[PDB]
Design a protein around this ligand. Structure first.
Ligand SMILES: N[C@@H](CCC(=O)N[C@@H](CS)C(=O)NCC(=O)O)C(=O)O
Ligand SMILES: N[C@@H](CCC(=O)N[C@@H](CS)C(=O)NCC(=O)O)C(=O)O
Lengths: 200, 200
């Protein structure tokens, strides 16, 4: 498998998931300003949406959307319990967290990274995010993983996006459960290995 | 089951999915300005995120996030083929579309519905949506469903959000595949019933 990525982007969650799934894969860095690969190929020819992540399977199937990529990977290794079985309530609680992270956190940060965002709107966006981080911090009060006792793909995604909170200098004072969670993730070897490989 | 909803909001997709899944459910209308139910209860006590949809199971389990709700329902009725089985590529293509609709379309429209959005930013958002609708229109070029030959939960969600393009008067000229999809959807009896029940 090939993972199309950019260091520290949302693709890090798919990258961590690949490692946690025990997969053989290679990383393919994308220049997202020119939308180009190192071999000169137009990235729009690979992913018409021009984003990372994308996962190219050996059969030539290209999967996009981080949440879809992480489910595909987790389903392939059910014994690792990265996602609970179909028709178990635990599964849909993980998918609930995945969708919240995708829609509320990841896309919540997006305007701060785009060139078409007016400067006057950024404080508004940052205020939205401050509120969402209070909710996440409360969800992490038992200080295990986001879904409770088991590490899941939701933890990989939440970690990736919360890193951005530090990148844009949100005020994280009083969010001690988030702090604990970030430390606990950085202690996982597969996480450390993904960060190292991305130069983070 | 109880579906917490607001007419025409994103909860319409979960509503359509309940009907397509053949479930016994009741609709509970939420006043999202006051965050109140008709019995006077604070809706924040039901869903701390204060949003629709939410789905209350008879055992008292509350499931939020429309994508999660729709997977839970579809997986319970596999013979209806609303979501393909685990480890079929078809399933991940549907999940891919669900995530695209959630993050790029649904959250793409969100600023147009919020009171904290500056007027000057609205044209920018509308331009982003214009480009996304060209992509969706091309994805619908075979004029079946969004994942090809079978109707899926992705179609329920895509229809729900595309109705907003009409609501905010985006220009849909030249997007004939979208037009055909909207008509095909409105011809499904369960979709008709959901629209009727929401007063749409
Ligand atoms: N809906 C996509 C969004 C992916 C996304 O936002 N990718 C960003 C990086 S975090 C990207 O590639 N931005 C580059 C661009 O669009 O030019 C997903 O969930 O995978
Ligand atoms: N991430 C949530 C988003 C749900 C959402 O945006 N709900 C809107 C309706 S489309 C809502 O309840 N808005 C009311 C509010 O937040 O006050 C999901 O995918 O289900």
């Amino acid at each position: 498998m090939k993972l199309f990525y950019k260091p520290g982007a949302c693709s890090l969650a798919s990258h961590i998931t690949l490692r946690e799934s025990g997969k053989d894969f290679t990383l393919v860095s994308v220049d997202l300003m020119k939308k180009r690969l190192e071999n000169g190929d137009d990235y729009f020819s690979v992913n018409p949406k021009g984003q990372v992540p994308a996962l190219l399977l050996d059969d030539g199937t290209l999967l996009t959307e981080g949440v879809a990529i992480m489910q595909y990977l987790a389903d392939s290794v059910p014994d690792r319990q990265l996602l609970a079985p179909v028709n178990s309530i635990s599964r849909y609680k993980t998918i609930e967290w995945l969708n919240y992270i995708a829609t509320e956190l990841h896309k919540g940060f997006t305007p701060l990274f785009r060139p078409d965002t007016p400067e006057e709107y950024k404080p508004t966006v940052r205020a939205q995010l401050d509120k969402k981080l209070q909710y996440v911090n409360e969800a992490l009060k038992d200080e295990h993983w986001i879904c409770g006792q088991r590490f899941t793909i939701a933890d990989a995604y939440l970690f990736t996006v919360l890193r951005w909170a530090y990148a844009v200098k949100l005020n994280l004072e009083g969010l001690e459960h988030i702090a604990a969670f970030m430390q606990r993730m950085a202690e996982r070897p597969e996480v450390q290995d993904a960060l190292s490989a991305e130069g983070l």
